Design a protein around this ligand. Structure first.
Ligand SMILES: [Mg+2]
Length: 496
């Protein structure tokens, strides 16, 4: 009458999926890393109306433990998609239906206690309809955790049953830096709360406030902030091939002085202005001034040889951080700009090709993880951008069709967090897709550690087995987990 099973972090559990074969879980992680798993529940006969869920400490040798304080629990909320995202090529969405995505937190981060009052509450819950309920479990490994094996439990209980499963965790003898190696720019347009920034930083994502009106050292020390934008927006975009004269060298220096002097600074100058060759000399004029002031120029455009020199005589490109879609990738031009000292980042939106990972709810969950980590590393890319995180509809917990344009509908476009009000909290809550992006950032970190230990070629051979390019990446979470384990076991070996 009470069927319980586990699923890996990037395995989608549908409401109608059959019970799996294991109720235990075996995980592996470094210090300073998250690993996650899911507990799925089904009532194949009747109803349990009052279901609770708890976890224990993870016990290691003797007295040794990882506290349950390091585990974060949520109940998955399913949202109904009535209109598919675009269907093209071989990378297709899974069809209209119920999708798990919003995460109902057991604990309000502001109180460290359960919410009350919410329209939706994590626990207790009812198990109905033969229809699955799913608990998401995050484990954060403490930076001081001794390497070795730890075991704890989860307990599912109701008025008519109780089932207990094992959580096995092996902690490897290495640590992910607090400051992530992968840089990012995720934009926030409407939610000005400190809690919204904080929710992103906790998932290893760097964010910038967009569209601010005229009216951090802590976040660095706590969350390892690794870059910051200065916010001189030229206003030039895909529809506006026009640019004003640049801020002056000392104007750029003045904005920069509001940040710590050790923090990597960029400027998001212009957006998708690639077709406007009109703008090359103005771009070079902006670049020369940023360069004199020690600031990187970031534009969402593909490398063009005309901009590989800023006209200052130094040889330096006019764009320092080239931000491209998967479909724009050109091996020869990317190798040229990497070789001369630039960065290339990836970004994603809509459904613009037949083959690339796509960022909508109705695609395979793996697509949010595979881009920042394995594919970026295989192609030498060092960052990720996303245009918006808070693009909510009027009914954000029930309607995720966030963009309708040109006969197409997009489910989750520009939307990675949900407002807290519906669950009785102030401030936003994560989605399952945000957890995948976090995991990809940690995947990127594994490869970076191996490069730094002098094992770049082997690391990239492993990276090419699951994420070699934008066309031939794995759709199988089991194979991705395998690849990651190979990396972690090698690092562990090298550090012992
Ligand atoms: Mg349609």
């Amino acid at each position: 009458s009470l069927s319980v099973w586990t699923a890996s972090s990037q395995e989608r559990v549908r409401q109608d999926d059959p019970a799996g074969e294991s109720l235990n879980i075996e995980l592996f992680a470094a210090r300073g890393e998250y690993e996650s798993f899911q507990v799925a529940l089904k009532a194949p006969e009747g109803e349990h109306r009052n279901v609770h869920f708890v976890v224990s400490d993870l016990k290691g040798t003797g007295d040794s433990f990882i506290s349950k304080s390091n585990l974060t629990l949520y109940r998955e909320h399913y949202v109904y998609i009535s209109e598919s995202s675009p269907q093209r090529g071989t990378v297709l969405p899974e069809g209209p239906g119920w999708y798990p995505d919003a995460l109902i937190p057991f604990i309000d981060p502001a109180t460290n206690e359960p919410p009350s009052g919410g329209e939706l509450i994590a626990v207790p819950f009812a198990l109905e309809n033969n229809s699955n309920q799913v608990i998401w479990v995050d484990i954060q490994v403490p930076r001081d955790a001794e390497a070795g094996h730890y075991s704890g439990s989860y307990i599912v209980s109701s008025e008519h049953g109780e089932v207990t499963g094992q959580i096995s965790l092996t902690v490897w003898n290495f640590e992910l830096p607090l400051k992530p190696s992968l840089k990012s720019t995720f934009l926030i347009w409407s939610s000005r709360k400190k809690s919204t920034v904080e929710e992103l930083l906790k998932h290893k994502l760097m964010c910038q406030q967009w569209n601010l009106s005229e009216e951090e050292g802590e976040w660095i020390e706590k969350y390892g902030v690794n870059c910051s934008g200065l916010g001189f927006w030229s206003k030039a975009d895909t529809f506006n091939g026009v640019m004003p004269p640049p801020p002056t060298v000392e104007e750029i220096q003045a904005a920069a002085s509001a940040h710590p002097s050790n923090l990597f600074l960029y400027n998001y100058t212009a957006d998708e202005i690639g077709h406007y060759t009109s703008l090359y000399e103005p771009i070079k004029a902006w670049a020369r001034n940023l360069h004199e002031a020690g600031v990187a120029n970031l534009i969402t455009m593909a490398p063009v040889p005309e901009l590989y020199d800023d006209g200052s005589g130094s040889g330096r490109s006019a764009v320092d951080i080239w931000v491209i879609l998967p479909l724009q990738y050109d091996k020869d031009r990317i190798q040229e700009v990497l070789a001369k000292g630039d960065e290339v980042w990836s970004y994603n939106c809509c459904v613009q090709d037949d083959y690339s990972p796509k960022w909508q709810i109705d695609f395979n969950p793996i697509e949010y993880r595979i881009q920042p980590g394995f594919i970026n590393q295989s192609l030498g890319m060092t960052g990720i951008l996303y245009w918006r995180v808070d693009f909510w509809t009027e009914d954000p917990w029930h309607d995720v069709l966030t963009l309708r344009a040109d006969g197409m509908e997009f489910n989750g476009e520009g939307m990675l967090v949900y407002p807290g009000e519906q669950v009785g909290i102030d401030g936003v809550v994560p989605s399952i897709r945000l957890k995948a992006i976090r995991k990809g950032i940690e995947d990127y970190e594994y490869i970076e550690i191996l490069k730094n230990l002098g094992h770049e070629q082997w690391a990239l051979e492993i990276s090419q087995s699951v994420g070699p390019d934008w066309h031939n990446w794995t759709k199988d979470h089991h194979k991705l987990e395998w690849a990651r384990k190979q990396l972690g076991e090698r690092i562990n070996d090298l550090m012992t």
